[PDB]
């Protein structure tokens, strides 16, 4: 979210 993990874009 950058909080929760996810791809950057």
């Amino acid at each position: 979210a950058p909080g929760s993990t996810a791809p950057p874009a």
Partner: antibody
Framework: QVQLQQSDAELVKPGASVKISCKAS????????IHWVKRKPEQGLEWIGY????????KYNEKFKGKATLTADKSSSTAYMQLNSLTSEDSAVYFC??????????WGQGTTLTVSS | DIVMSQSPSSLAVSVGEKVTMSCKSS????????????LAWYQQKPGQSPKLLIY???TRESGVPDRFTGSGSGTDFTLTISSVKAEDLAVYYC?????????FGSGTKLERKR
């Protein structure tokens, strides 16, 4: 310790639905998203979508929106993928796997689906 | 959708020698905020689950032998096995982790030269 235990092989007729399970143990289920991946002979690997049971976030590959449904039962630490209107194109090995590529990457043993009349 | 391309489709390798495998992305996988390439390499052997070898293009996953090395940046990536062993004869897939939908290359299968 960590395991993702998938349900047994499925053999079904064209047009049927199937629901595959992926039971997590050895860690806290809500801590990691479960992604689903299709391994079909001569079609490498394909990402289907994920369910994040901690925040109930679900995302699909556009190709599978309308075809696949991802659910999760927090009480039994189990993720589910349902596939509908099955064709021989759906015959494949389906894997559940934990998290993103990185330190938490971990895979189930796979479930074979055969669709045939 | 990011298109991942791998060549060659298969490769006859001499056991004990170095092998290099290529992967190309249709879009840059380099994220300017953290300077990381969101590219992973997986191994798969028949009847087994995929195993993560490399992520962030060059970070070796836990329990992966040192003969495996990832390099490259942007759109052009390489997986190297120094001194390939018989147990390394398998299919190698790159995967971009940069944006949804996650997409994989079509794989490079390593077979043994004789």
């Amino acid at each position: 310790q960590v395991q993702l235990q998938q349900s047994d092989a499925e053999l079904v007729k064209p047009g049927a639905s199937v629901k595959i399970s992926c039971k997590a143990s050895g860690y806290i289920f809500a801590d990691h998203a479960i992604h689903w991946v299709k391994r079909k002979p001569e079609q490498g690997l394909e990402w289907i979508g994920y369910i994040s049971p901690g925040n109930d976030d679900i995302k699909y590959n556009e190709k599978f929106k309308g075809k696949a449904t991802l659910t999760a039962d927090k009480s039994s630490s189990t993720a589910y993928m349902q596939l509908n209107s099955l064709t021989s194109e759906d015959s494949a090995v389906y894997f559940c796997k934990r998290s993103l590529p990185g330190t938490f990457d971990y895979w189930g043993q796979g479930t074979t689906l055969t669709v045939s009349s | 959708d990011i298109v991942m391309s791998q060549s060659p489709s298969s490769l006859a390798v001499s056991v004990g020698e170095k092998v290099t495998m290529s992967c190309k992305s249709s879009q840059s996988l380099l994220y300017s905020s953290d300077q990381k390439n969101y590219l992973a390499w997986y191994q798969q052997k028949p009847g087994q689950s995929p195993k993560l070898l490399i992520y962030w293009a060059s970070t070796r996953e836990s329990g992966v032998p040192d003969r495996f090395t990832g390099s490259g940046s942007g759109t052009d990536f390489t997986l190297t096995i120094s001194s390939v062993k018989a147990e390394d004869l398998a299919v190698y897939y790159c995967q971009q982790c940069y944006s949804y939908p996650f997409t994989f290359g079509s794989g490079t299968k390593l077979e043994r030269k004789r």
